[PDB]
Design a protein around this ligand. Structure first.
Ligand SMILES: *[C@@H]1O[C@H](CO)[C@@H](O)[C@H](O)[C@H]1NC(C)=O
Ligand SMILES: *[C@@H]1O[C@H](CO)[C@@H](O)[C@H](O)[C@H]1NC(C)=O
Ligand SMILES: *[C@@H]1O[C@H](CO)[C@@H](O)[C@H](O)[C@H]1NC(C)=O
Ligand SMILES: *[C@@H]1O[C@H](CO)[C@@H](O)[C@H](O)[C@H]1NC(C)=O
Ligand SMILES: *[C@@H]1O[C@H](CO)[C@@H](O)[C@H](O)[C@H]1NC(C)=O
Length: 639
């Protein structure tokens, strides 16, 4: 595991507080609980000691109590991911209104270990506060956390690595990787929303009132499942997978946790063929977009797993699911959406650009799965795809604004649909894609890229899709600059975790998120904001899987302003790696790339002149940086 120094995952599953932030009251030696083999912090009466673990973590709190003056003594534990919500009186929020209660332990009953329930596992918290409710003098021998995230993983045994000359990019990579494994949970501790239906937005739980909190629900079978957010929801969401899967793939290869989540959604497919908006405990809302995002997960899993048997097991369910979505396509050749529910965007309906771009992407990915199982293509899927591309550009493209309309009925040009159009090749030219890229970077604010479809929100979900779209319009600089702007804020703003990545915020730097009135409920660990991890491995390093487990590949690095990149990730067939070092001229003075043997791929080095030489003696001369159909192995650029 190269560059393991950048890995933010814990080396142990039993963690002791790293530093002491704030001590209110009288505690004689609070920093004694900072050590692994010590501890006698004596809380003299009502007091509070805030701790900092230095990173977002998850687990079950355990207190060893040595001395208590009173038998009615209590020790409370609170948790928060952000510094904004550090309080002795309450935790963060997992409900649509109100901060969560402190975990209370009756430490006066006797000396000994006091461990929390598995239902009171906290899914994500960087700062932990211990508070005393009584006049008792209580000795705390030890406070430790049992790290519960990524249960079936070796937390730091990374299958992938990324290093460049920009340390912010290197830190964003390992942050998103760690963001994903912290929302990778034991399915027994799912649904952090126990009061869905009970507590709502207009419920105004306030001031001294705190809220009960537990997890409970076995949202999936198996040992481990990837969820949307570590602290809150803790559910399986289809749309979040189109970012987290590949980011998980290039870091830990925990495709087991992904398969766990995809099979849970597939098992809940309706009679119609409609895949669900979320996993079982959540409300039965109809989403055309998220239904296709689950079909994207079937394609994405076969691409990275290589498991043709898994594909055949779910090929019929995939085909029935596509059928349900093709039903909304009308005479215009576009799909008319009558279901509004999406990620947060408000205008989903009619001939939406995002929906039709996702359907086009799904239809073309369905053709390769057809070729995988049946060794042919579907002609019906080809015409519907061609019709979407024709009608989207005829009815929704505006050449003065350089962007697609959300529908024919509006002046709004959305971030999701325009980033998805380049991702789906719904565009007719690289220049049309380059025009969208320029027009989306036009709207960038001081804290990130805005989504006008979702009020004042800065969505890292769509931002990651926009990063891939910038690269695909062959504008690598704008993509890197969005990461440095948006994710540098997400990683280095003092109200963040410096380890995991937030679910969303707003154009004004405030960490308020549009769908929530409870800003403390926002998740600083969401896997759908881990896109830069996969994109830096795919587009900057150039390591593209174009076939199952990399059976076919494309080595096309787009380094931008970077001078040195050393990156690699692992599939079933082998390791995909590269170590290239450019110059002030922007020309590769050193390039080595590694692909598994018994595989075939193409190489685009962008005008770079030289010969690619294999370790087994093969030599291929480049034509405008072009190499076509070269066999797998480790190749060196020789000038
Ligand atoms: C402190 O809090 C615990 C748990 O909420 C409660 O049972 C106890 O009565 C409280 N004691 C005082 C002195 O407030
Ligand atoms: C969830 O925990 C609550 C206790 O807070 C209990 O009422 C319920 O039975 C639990 N559900 C499951 C599935 O364990
Ligand atoms: C078109 O998009 C706008 C903005 O997204 C939305 O408000 C409007 O309802 C949409 N129209 C239809 C017919 O869906
Ligand atoms: C994208 O579309 C253009 C025409 O609009 C086509 O020439 C090109 O081959 C397409 N690219 C891919 C990867 O399908
Ligand atoms: C954030 O993390 C980096 C390492 O990833 C570290 O160098 C830096 O000091 C940290 N900053 C804060 C404020 O914790």
């Amino acid at each position: 595991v190269p560059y393991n120094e950048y890995i933010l995952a814990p080396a142990s599953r039993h963690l002791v507080p790293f530093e002491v932030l704030e001590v209110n009251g009288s505690v004689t030696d609070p920093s004694s609980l900072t050590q692994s083999t010590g501890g006698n912090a004596t809380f003299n009466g009502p007091a509070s000691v805030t701790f900092d673990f230095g990173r977002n973590i998850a687990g079950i709190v355990s207190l060893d109590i040595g001395s208590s003056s009173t038998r009615d003594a209590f020790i409370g534990v609170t948790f928060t991911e952000s510094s904004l919500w550090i309080s002795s009186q309450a935790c963060d929020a997992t409900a649509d209104s109100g901060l969560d209660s402190p975990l209370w332990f009756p430490v006066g009953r006797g000396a000994g270990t006091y461990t929390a329930d598995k239902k009171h596992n906290r899914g994500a918290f960087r700062y932990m506060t211990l508070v005393t409710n009584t006049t008792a003098v209580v000795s705390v021998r030890n406070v430790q956390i049992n790290y519960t995230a990524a249960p079936s993983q070796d937390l730091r045994a990374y299958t992938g690595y990324f290093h460049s000359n920009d340390e912010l990019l290197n830190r964003v990579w390992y942050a998103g990787a760690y963001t994903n494994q912290i929302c990778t949970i034991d399915p027994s501790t799912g649904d952090a929303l126990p009061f869905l239906g009970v507590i709502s937005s207009d419920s105004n739980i306030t001031l001294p009132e705190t809220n009960p909190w537990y997890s409970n629900y076995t949202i999936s079978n198996g040992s481990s499942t990837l969820t949307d957010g570590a602290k809150r929801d803790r559910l399986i969401w289809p749309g979040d997978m189109s970012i987290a899967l590949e980011s998980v793939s290039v870091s830990t290869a925990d495709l087991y946790s992904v398969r766990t989540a995809l099979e849970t959604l597939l098992s809940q497919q309706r009679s119609d063929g409609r895949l669900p908006y979320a996993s079982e405990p959540f409300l039965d809302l109809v989403s055309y977009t998220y239904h296709l995002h689950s079909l994207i997960g079937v394609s994405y899993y076969y691409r990275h797993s290589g498991d043709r048997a898994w594909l055949s097991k779910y090929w019929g369910q995939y085909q029935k699911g596509l059928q349900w979505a093709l039903s909304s396509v009308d005479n215009t050749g576009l799909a008319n959406i009558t279901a509004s529910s999406d990620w947060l965007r408000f205008g989903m309906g009619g001939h939406n650009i995002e929906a039709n771009a996702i359907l086009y992407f799904v239809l073309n990915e369905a053709q390769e799965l057809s070729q995988a199982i049946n060794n042919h293509t579907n002609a019906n899927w080809t015409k519907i795809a061609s019709g979407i591309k024709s009608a989207t550009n005829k009815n929704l493209w505006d050449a003065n604004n350089g962007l697609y309309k959300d529908n024919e009925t509006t002046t709004l040009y959305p971030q999701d649909g325009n980033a998805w159009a380049i991702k789906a090749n719904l565009t007719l030219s690289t220049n049309q894609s380059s025009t969208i890229s320029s027009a989306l970077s036009s709207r960038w604010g001081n804290y990130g890229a805005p989504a006008p479809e979702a009020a004042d929100a800065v969505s890292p979900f769509i931002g990651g899709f926009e990063i891939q779209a910038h690269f695909l319009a062959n504008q690598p600089q704008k993509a890197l600059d969005l990461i440095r702007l948006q994710w540098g804020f997400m990683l280095d703003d003092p109200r963040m975790t410096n380890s995991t990545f937030i679910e969303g915020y707003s154009t004004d730097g405030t960490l308020h998120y549009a769908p929530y009135t409870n800003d403390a409920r926002v998740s600083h660990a969401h896997g759908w904001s881990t896109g830069p991890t996969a994109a830096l491995s795919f587009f900057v390093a150039g390591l593209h899987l174009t076939g199952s487990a990399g059976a076919t590949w494309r080595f096309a690095p787009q380094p931008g302003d970077l001078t040195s990149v050393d990156a690699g990730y692992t599939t079933a067939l082998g390791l995909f790696s590269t170590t290239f070092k450019r110059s002030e001229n922007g020309d590769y003075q050193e390039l080595t790339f590694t692909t598994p043997q018994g595989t075939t791929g193409d190489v685009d080095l962008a005008g770079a002149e030289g010969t690619l030489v294999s370790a087994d003696g093969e030599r291929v001369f480049l034509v405008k940086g072009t190499a076509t159909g070269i066999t797998g192995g480790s190749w060196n650029l020789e000038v």
